[PDB]
Amino acid sequence: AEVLLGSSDGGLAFVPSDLSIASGEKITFKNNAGFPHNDLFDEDEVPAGVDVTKISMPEEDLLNAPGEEYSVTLTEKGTYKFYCAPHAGAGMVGKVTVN
Numbered sequence: 001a002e003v004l005l006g007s008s009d010g011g012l013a014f015v016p017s018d019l020s021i022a023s024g025e026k027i028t029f030k031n032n033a034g035f036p037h038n039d040l041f042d043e044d045e046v047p048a049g050v051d052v053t054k055i056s057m058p059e060e061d062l063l064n065a066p067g068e069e070y071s072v073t074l075t076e077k078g079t080y081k082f083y084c085a086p087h088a089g090a091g092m093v094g095k096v097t098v099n
């Protein structure tokens, strides 16, 4: 699955912000517009047994340019919430469900 970081007209969102994949699918977050962005999983909203540090970009790493991306494969079933640090207050938050 592919997720865009920022919308064509600079809007501060994940596109799409709600996705469902199957266990073992790869999500590739691609830097699109409205830089900079990053991807952090919410420690409170992840399936028990998921290690957040293993699955997240460090909160301070940022993608500042086109072509930059972040890939992660999720295996545990259930719902994970994620956000973009710089834009958390702007509502750039999303959610994946692994089936």
Ligand SMILES: [Cu+2]
Residues within 6 Å of the ligand: 012, 036, 037, 038, 084, 085, 086, 087, 092
């Ligand atoms: Cu962002």
